[PDB]
Amino acid sequence: SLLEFGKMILEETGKLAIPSYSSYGCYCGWGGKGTPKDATDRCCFVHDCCYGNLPDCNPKSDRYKYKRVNGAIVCEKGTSCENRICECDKAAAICFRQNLNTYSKKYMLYPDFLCKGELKC
């Protein structure tokens, strides 16, 4: 679920998901078009594709269970949708952590008209 993914992002990165990732670039938090602006935005593009792979799941509201094993995120077994949604969110949180070194505040509230073209998942 969205709130759960937000907490995972905060725990991972130390950034609050809103406002740090909720409107970043072309893909983080809204939008479906254009070339991702940077590696962080690419994480969101891939996460959007990940959710897109699950058209009969509901990642915004469906809560999955996961644990931290030392630092490792381990998705615990729930329904197939929860397992799949968890792996999507785990990957995005890791991706965000891997790219904090290039995260740029200049892409927060990035305007829609600068995001053009379909990029296929």
CA–CA distance, 70 with 72 (Å, rounded to integer): 6
CA–CA distance, 121 with 118 (Å, rounded to integer): 9
Contacts with another protein by CB under 8 A: the residue count is 19
Residue 27 annotated as binding site: yes
Q: Is 2 in the site for another protein (CB under 8 A)?
A: yes
Active site residue 62: no
CB-CB contact of 84 with 57 (8 Å) = yes
Q: Is 99 in the site for another protein (CB under 8 A)?
A: no
Q: Is 85 in the site for another protein (CB under 8 A)?
A: no
CA–CA distance, 8 with 27 (Å, rounded to integer): 18
Choice between 28 and 85, CB closer to another protein: 28
Residue ranges binding another protein (CB under 8 A):
2-3, 5-7, 9-10, 16-19, 21-22, 24, 28-29, 44, 47, 92
